[PDB]
From Swiss-Prot, chains A, B:
Domain commentary: The PI3K-ABD domain and the PI3K-RBD domain interact with the PI3K/PI4K kinase domain. The C2 PI3K-type domain may facilitate the recruitment to the plasma membrane. The inhibitory interactions with PIK3R1 are mediated by the PI3K-ABD domain and the C2 PI3K-type domain with the iSH2 (inter-SH2) region of PIK3R1, and the C2 PI3K-type domain, the PI3K helical domain, and the PI3K/PI4K kinase domain with the nSH2 (N-terminal SH2) region of PIK3R1.
Role played: Phosphoinositide-3-kinase (PI3K) phosphorylates phosphatidylinositol (PI) and its phosphorylated derivatives at position 3 of the inositol ring to produce 3-phosphoinositides. Uses ATP and PtdIns(4,5)P2 (phosphatidylinositol 4,5-bisphosphate) to generate phosphatidylinositol 3,4,5-trisphosphate (PIP3). PIP3 plays a key role by recruiting PH domain-containing proteins to the membrane, including AKT1 and PDPK1, activating signaling cascades involved in cell growth, survival, proliferation, motility and morphology. Participates in cellular signaling in response to various growth factors.
PI3K-RBD domain sequence ranges: 31-133
Record protein name field: Phosphatidylinositol 4,5-bisphosphate 3-kinase catalytic subunit alpha isoform
Anything else known: The avian sarcoma virus 16 genome encodes an oncogene derived from PIK3CA.
Residue range from the parent sequence: 157 to 298 of 1068
Lineage: Eukaryota, Metazoa, Chordata, Craniata, Vertebrata
Subunit text: Heterodimer of a catalytic subunit PIK3CA and a p85 regulatory subunit (PIK3R1, PIK3R2 or PIK3R3). Interacts with IRS1 in nuclear extracts. Interacts with RUFY3. Interacts with RASD2. Interacts with APPL1. Interacts with HRAS and KRAS. Interaction with HRAS/KRAS is required for PI3K pathway signaling and cell proliferation stimulated by EGF and FGF2. Interacts with FAM83B; activates the PI3K/AKT signaling cascade.
Species per Swiss-Prot/TrEMBL record: Homo sapiens (Human)
Family: Belongs to the PI3/PI4-kinase family.
Disease: PIK3CA mutations are involved in various type of cancer. Mutated isoforms participate in cellular transformation and tumorigenesis induced by oncogenic receptor tyrosine kinases (RTKs) and HRAS/KRAS. Interaction with HRAS/KRAS is required for Ras-driven tumor formation. Mutations increasing the lipid kinase activity are required for oncogenic signaling. The protein kinase activity may not be required for tumorigenesis.
Length: 142, 142
């Protein structure tokens, strides 16, 4: 089986049955938008950097990856064609997970449909997420 | 004629000539096991939930239903008799099909002998399957 399949089997997504967000949960957001923190390892010294994003609650994990690139590329050092290539490149290179936990967001679902996010919203807690390279995920498989 | 007989005539299986898997295809599996995706409709609003299973390639469709039952009841501390009762009940209530396509797995064949499954194995792709209520299939017959 493909490494993508084995990651799905080992780390199955914890999504809700409906993508429709309950009204009492949606009202806890800022006009349906949720503030999340995105971590990443940027240096060989395992130094971690972070971005604080405000995104729609129904963003899929691949849209979170794209939104984090737009946050960084605000300071322009690349053309538009280079930027589009970088978004597609890193969308196929990185996956999203909960920081410090064995909870992953490998499948295309609205972020708020994942159970970890809903508990974060109901608890008034900020989702603490990490961008991990797909190859680093495939190497830790049994 | 019986409704099950009518379903076989209307939806005949697309199977390969031999149940023996060629070596170059078998070697694409993880020690003879295939990872499949099983969808199901859980709410009257047609909300779908899914399981990602790793099963023997020569499981018959009724064994796929049994493996999905063991997946859900894994934590429930059920006895063998309790588990068997649920397995027999849902084996007589649900059939297996390709999700979103008019391809069915109604007959006792090794799953890998079906042409859709074997091509999935050769592609390194997960079979995208759906569990449909038997009565819903018999109602759509001519
Ligand atoms: C084609 C893609 C490409 O070449 N690049 C250039 C490098 N790059 N880094 C990130 C990225 N950067 C940060 C970040 C924030 C703040 C920082 C530093 C360093 N010093 N400070 C103060 C780095 C970051 C923080 C969280 S996530 C992230 C990313 C980032 C991203 F937004 C989306 C991703 F898919 C991956 C990454 O990180 C990859 C690890 O570093 C290479 C984006 C890029 C892209 C545009
Ligand atoms: C004696 C048998 C019996 O009473 N039950 C109880 C109900 N039941 N549901 C399933 C089943 N559940 C899921 C599933 C997975 C993840 C879920 C939800 C809801 N929320 N989350 C996060 C439901 C499921 C997903 C794919 S297949 C499946 C099944 C399932 C099965 F494994 C085998 C089948 F033959 C049928 C079904 O689903 C039938 C639809 O009813 C919900 C199993 C049972 C059994 C144990």
């Amino acid at each position: 089986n493909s490494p993508h399949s084995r990651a799905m089997y080992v780390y199955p997504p914890n999504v809700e049955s409906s993508p429709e967000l309950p009204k009492h949960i949606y009202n806890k957001l800022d006009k349906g938008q949720i503030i999340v923190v995105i971590w990443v390892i940027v240096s060989p010294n395992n130094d971690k950097q972070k971005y604080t994003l405000k995104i729609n609650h129904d963003c899929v994990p691949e849209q979170v990856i794209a939104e984090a690139i737009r946050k960084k590329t605000r300071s322009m050092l690349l053309s538009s064609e280079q930027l589009k290539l970088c978004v597609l490149e890193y969308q196929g290179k990185y996956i999203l997970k909960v920081c410090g936990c064995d909870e992953y967001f490998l499948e295309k679902y609205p972020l708020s449909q994942y159970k970890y996010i809903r508990s974060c919203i109901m608890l008034g807690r900020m989702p603490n997420l990490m961008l991990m390279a797909k190859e680093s995920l495939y190497s830790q498989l049994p």
